[PDB]
Design a protein around this ligand. Structure first.
Ligand code: MN
Ligand code: MN
Ligand code: MN
Ligand code: MN
Lengths: 328, 328, 326, 328
């Protein structure tokens, strides 16, 4: 991968986020998703890569754009691409917290080619966190005890994040019984997982079941930021098992570590759509100095150098014109 | 009011927030409320005021502490006090957004003496916003057209905030049908209303029905920040109408403007408990330079001077002990 | 001291900074100093203390004089004062100009004459007494500081003032491998920077005013760190001042506890941008109109609580700026 | 110019800034300059451009690297390049304020090919400022009266920045006489001119004489941020006139508008070396999640889009190792 594509990825997530923000709070999940997909595809085809979508909007039969296997880019180094044009379509439609646009790139085969199934996840931040600090087969209590010891705090200081779902009741109960503080997000476990390794997020541990593509994207970010994560694909019927087999996955109970989900040279980029526990959302700003503009907040990182860049971008815009001029 | 009480009010809201934070994500709404009430009462009794609670936890037969009429303070200038020890008890218990501790002070009779009933609210920020820019008897569409013209933006740029409740469905649809973006909060319409006059909140208008004491608190802050707000009390049974009558209110459909809710010299102080659209919440911080500490984020403001102060406070704490050492 | 006075102090420094700022870059050192003094005295007299100025603008010509009684009535406090640390700074619009107030219980501050003072300072709550000492070599001081901070010598940033009298310090610190950065003026800011987050300054070594050293020590006692100071006597009459104040060990080395002891409150507000605080700025907004923004810090040694205050003060900049004077 | 080169320019300025920072406060302006030159040339040759140095380190007879005319880059779109490996070598050697590293790119002929001579400069920020607001032949007083009118402030509110030099005494005296506030910098009139269009700089106007290539670099930035500037080359001896003639300039008293200094599509990038009135300098940071790193603060901007990006970058480093490891 050319060093240039890292910083080019942030332009993609910025344009996707502005498109999504034009649909924020319009109550149309589909329109928000479509605005993001359009902008991200358009932006991607200007990046100097020979890219193949390995995680994206879905299979070609269900997704006309950014489908698994689609070729993207203007030509260049060959890369596998893990996309989320809009992480949080419902989030964005309701103006909720933790909506992001996400783009990750790897050398060929770098990402777990994961099906659209659920995935158990446990994640903690810290560059010094050793392999095995978290393990899905151990109890919540033991994982949290090891994490508290590694961070040098009493159990009661720990903030565990999980999604507000019935499937997480037991997690929430056990964590709380062993003394930790457990906070709940409505949607957005990409942001929720990455927040374990984000400065001043207030979140120490993520534990929960969510989308498998979302789990891989989070693992790419954690590979760059430092931390440990374990994941395990869940299968509820024969159709899901068939998706797995179609993507080359046959060990259905495998526990994946970070290196199994995203390996080698990884670039991760994200932009906030709404305010979240990882990134701030797009905002309209006035000024006589430069006129009105939209502000976006992004992060781009790469696993080889561990360099992390936080980017605040000012995009000229006349808010007397309709906001949907931010689309494509 | 002596100028000193303004800055002493932030110490009160800070201690209340740290006590509340020790209960964040513990799933105990009652214990979070009680930690906040205890810390706020203890800190209030060290403020050099002759204070009378006019907005508080409730009536004495239902609230043992910080009840309507309670005398508080170490002695000094006479003030009416509007309190919210924890705005967002459920929020705090679940670690959701927009939880605050709030303390406002006025000269005697400065706050609307309303019963604890629902209140229709409409609020916009801006020092130059004229009286009448918002009116509860006009349609959502006409209010929003006037706001869009005053702010100099297309209707689609406006971000209207309201709570995610069935009672707001009509508002949601109409705003969206006229072209605006409408974002939903799960709770905390104090922060929701104050966000309209808060820099970089990304919220332009609040329209919703919520608690009347919360409406008064938000109006006090807006009196200091600059903005317009109209309220109308709602009565759902004969006992609530009786409450109004015993307090001297017979015009049940009265539209209160910002000056009717909070008049004269007003001091307003608030500290974040969780991250919200007005203030950031408490965080645990490490440093070799000063050791570990909790950071609080507060605001204090005064209507006479319009001076606004944003306070970031570092409170030393050894997080090897239990977090509940932050309780008073 | 009541907890109330801590937060009242910051209002004092903010008002002094706004009045100083009205005179920033006007090339009138005297007018700056007078605007600052007027604002600070008027604000101090509304604070509920029986205050006594023990360190201030020492010559009456330069009205917050040694021994003056200030305050509206309350607990007895000694007041260590600088209405404007950097009169020349503010008048030139140079870096590191501050307004500063420290308070202690009676006798808490060193009673030092208006003489020069050798200083060495480092930040860090865990730094032990003896990490810095004015009789050890610059080299050995820096070796201990590098070890304490866990960095290579070459990473250390030493701050001193750009004066001939610091040539030897500068040479030796660079000889041993450290980076040495120079400030035009403002060794209050320069010393406190050693314990300020993101200042980029690890150590201060230099000679400056004794009052400024006491003020910096008061802040370091709240922020965490170590400092040593020694008074310098060039004239017979400076020695006589010292004798008049009960000092006969002229070569005494003062640790921080000797400079500022007991319960200490320290407050400062930036006038110009510097290595500890940001300076006052003019801001526009449709939302609240125009305002001046001040950046302040207030801290207390007993609790170690530190508050950073960003304050927005309404102002019509179509009117002359000197309406910010008291 | 491809959109990718904009964000690639920042990597160049960041690497030059890190290398300069390793020499900060070492009292060796030659060594600081050489570290910056080496790092900038090595980073530039990885940028996908066909570049020609029009403003650089010097003429080939005096500068072996980054000399006027040198071809640089890895190959790509053709660009003229205006370089300052280290703006403020003496600054950086003393750890003084306002040192920057600077890289700007334009379409061919975009920059004034300026000789190494002094240049009178006057500059003001603001997208609405009209050509003629500043003019070197009007008095300081009349320039300042127009700028006060344009900004809507009393003359006493204005802050004029200039360098502390004898040649500027008349400026300083007249500006103070007409009522403005005049703040002085020891060095760094690239930063000082750009500060006029930087948010919260506190600097309204820059007036003074400095390096001509520095004037062109600042003009490039102002063309992206919005502002007006006028410049005039001045000549002290025959050698300096010859420097002008060698570059095709015989109209020695020409006044250059901002469009004469930098025109067309311009990308401008800069990174702080030391804290200054436009950018913060490099800092050493410790973290209990990421380890130690150096933080750089950069900006990159483009005149066609007016997009401005503020970039905070975290560069992994073990500070137990010698700081000279930042020289690449
Ligand atoms: Mn998606
Ligand atoms: Mn409450
Ligand atoms: Mn002084
Ligand atoms: Mn240079």
């Amino acid at each position: 991968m050319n060093r240039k594509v890292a910083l080019e990825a942030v332009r993609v997530t910025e344009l996707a986020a502005l498109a999504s923000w034009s649909q924020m709070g319009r109550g149309d999940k589909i329109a928000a998703d479509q605005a993001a997909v359009d902008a991200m595809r358009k932006a991607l085809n200007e990046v100097d890569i020979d890219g193949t979508v390995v995680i994206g909007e879905g299979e070609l039969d269900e997704a006309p754009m950014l489908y698994i296997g689609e070729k993207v880019g203007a030509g260049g180094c060959e890369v596998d691409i893990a996309l989320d044009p809009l992480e949080g379509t419902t989030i964005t439609s309701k103006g909720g917290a933790n909506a992001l646009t996400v783009l990750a790139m790897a050398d060929k085969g770098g990402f777990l080619n994961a099906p659209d199934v659920y995935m158990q996840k446990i994640a903690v931040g810290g560059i010094n966190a050793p392999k095995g600090i978290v393990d899905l087969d151990d109890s919540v209590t033991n994982n949290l005890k090891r994490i508290a010891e590694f961070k040098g705090v009493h159990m009661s200081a720990l903030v565990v994040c999980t999604m507000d779902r019935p499937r997480h009741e037991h997690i929430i109960k056990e964590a709380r019984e062993c003394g930790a503080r457990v906070i709940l997000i409505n949607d957005g476990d990409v942001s929720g997982v990455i927040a374990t390794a984000t400065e001043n997020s207030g979140i120490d541990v993520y534990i929960g079941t969510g989308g498998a593509p979302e789990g891989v994207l989070a693992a790419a970010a954690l590979k760059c930021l430092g931390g440990q994560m374990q994941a395990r694909l869940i299968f509820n019927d024969e159709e899901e098992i068939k998706r797995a087999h179609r993507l080359g996955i046959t060990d259905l109970n495998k526990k994946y570590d970070i290196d199994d989900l995203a390996s080698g040279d990884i670039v991760f980029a994200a932009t906030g759509v709404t305010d979240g526990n990882m990134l701030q959302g797009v905002k309209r700003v006035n000024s006589t100095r430069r006129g009105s503009y939209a502000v976006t907040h992004s992060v781009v990182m790469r696993s080889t150098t561990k360099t992390v860049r936080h980017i605040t971008a000012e995009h000229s815009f006349d808010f007397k014109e309709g906001i949907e001029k931010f689309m494509s």
